[PDB]
């Protein structure tokens, strides 16, 4: 039932049975890895690469074509982000709400939602420190959060 | 969310037993369930079952007969000490003659009848009768 809301939604991508598809496809393992390193250099997140691939170009999935996932390829090349994308987009959301909330102080609903996103940042950071995807002793501060994004 | 995989499937089984279905599917399937269903199948409580190999946990579809009155599960998985297998089934099973406790042991998953003669206790898993 999600997490924070009461909503209980079943919507998801359901991946196919066969692997290394498709028979119709060709190109190469090598040429796809060049395209990913090109678009990462353009400045584009691991989610946004695989959207750009399956939409315009071929490849349904990169894990089908190459052995590796997209973030595995970026981290091998050394064109990976500093912090992971889900933690990035939660912090950027929290900074956006703090601009709104210190303009409009009487908005109680915005004050409620800022607790929920910043609570999620703290617990999701505690994951990423355990897996060593973040430097040790890395912590969220609402003073220094805005410069940390961009 | 979904702590015991075996605990869901035996409730799914025993419901659709009492309704009186010919066959039922269960989900998400495991290595423990196929071994638990295997030691029902020896004693003659269910027929055949397939286990579809979807690229996931998988689905187990069992043919069944009108034979199980009930099967259940003992969470928490208590420890028992060969002395105390007799004390459990006096409390738990409907009679001394028929029924089975079933309990994981370092010589594989097995019934309490097999656990007596091999002479090793373990952790209790469930039961059926």
């Amino acid at each position: 039932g999600r997490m924070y809301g009461p909503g209980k939604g079943m919507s998801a991508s359901a991946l196919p049975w066969r692997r290394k598809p498709p028979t119709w496809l060709k190109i190469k393992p090598s040429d796809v890895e060049e395209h990913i390193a090109k678009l990462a250099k353009k400045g584009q997140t691991p989610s946004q690469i695989g959207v750009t691939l399956r939409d315009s170009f071929g490849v349904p999935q990169v894990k089908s074509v190459t052995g590796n996932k997209i973030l595995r390829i970026l981290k091998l090349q050394g064109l990976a982000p500093e912090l992971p994308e889900d933690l990035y987009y939660l912090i950027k959301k929290a900074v956006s709400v703090r601009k709104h909330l210190e303009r409009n102080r009487k908005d109680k609903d915005a004050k409620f939602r800022l607790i929920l996103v910043e609570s999620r940042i703290h617990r999701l950071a505690r994951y990423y420190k355990r897996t060593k995807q973040l430097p040790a002793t890395w912590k969220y501060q609402s003073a220094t959060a805005s410069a940390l994004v961009a | 969310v979904r702590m015991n995989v075996l605990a869901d499937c035996l409730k799914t089984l025993v419901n659709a037993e009492k309704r009186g279905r010919r066959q039922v599917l269960i989900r998400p399937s495991s290595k423990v369930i196929i071994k638990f269903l295997q030691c029902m199948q020896r004693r003659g409580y269910i027929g055949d079952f397939e286990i579809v190999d979807d690229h996931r946990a998988g689905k187990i579809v069992i043919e069944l007969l009108g034979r199980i009155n009930k099967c259940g599960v003992i969470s928490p998985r208590f420890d028992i000490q060969v002395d105390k297998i007799e004390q459990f089934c006096s409390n738990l099973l409907p009679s001394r003659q028929f029924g089975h406790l079933v309990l994981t042991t370092a010589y594989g998953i097995m019934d309490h009848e097999e656990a007596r003669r091999k002479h090793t206790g373990g952790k209790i898993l469930g039961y059926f009768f």
Partner: protein, 177 residues
């Protein structure tokens, strides 16, 4: 050695010189490791199983696969099915060093690597049965499209024999209606 490995090795440099030979040049890269004389029950002919070094079997030899199998079938009679030598790794593994034991090397992944390789069509779906006798009859539903060669219907029997000789496990194939 052995006798059958020489017989299969004799056939390969005949495939080189066949006036033109479409795939003769390509094979030179190809090399063979070992064989196994497997006979299907009530089999019309014994079917040779040819093992392949893994490096050779990747980019170098699986590019065609199908064309090569039909040539050795008409040349040598019999049937033939062509697989990679996967090393395996025993559970004790930690002894004698090593740490990760990557799961490509483990026993489930090797035996899955057999099936993809032996049928050679691909598999639409895979399913296993557990009988009241208590023997696990596996099933491997091949794709109904592209049935192609009549031999596939005859060769559908011998995969049960080939799978049983390697892994000691019962497998039944067939095509879904």
């Amino acid at each position: 050695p052995t006798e059958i490995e020489n017989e299969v090795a004799k056939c390969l440099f005949d495939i080189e010189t066949s006036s033109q030979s479409d795939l003769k040049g390509d094979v030179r890269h190809l090399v063979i490791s070992s064989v196994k004389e497997v006979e299907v029950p009530q089999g019309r002919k014994k079917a040779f199983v040819v093992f392949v070094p893994h490096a050779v079997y990747q980019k170098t030899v699986k590019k065609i696969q199908g064309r090569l199998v039909q040539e050795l079938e008409k040349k040598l009679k019999k049937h033939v099915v062509l697989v990679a030598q996967r090393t395996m790794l025993p559970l004790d593994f930690k002894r004698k060093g090593l740490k990760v034991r990557p799961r490509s090397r483990t026993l489930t992944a090797v035996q899955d690597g057999m099936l993809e390789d032996i049928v050679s069509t691909e598999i639409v779906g895979k399913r296993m049965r557990v009988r009241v006798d208590n023997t696990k009859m596996l099933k491997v539903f091949l794709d109904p499209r592209d049935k192609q060669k009549d031999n596939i219907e005859d060769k559908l029997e011998t995969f049960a024999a080939v799978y049983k000789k390697l892994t000691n496990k019962d497998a039944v194939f067939s095509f879904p209606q």
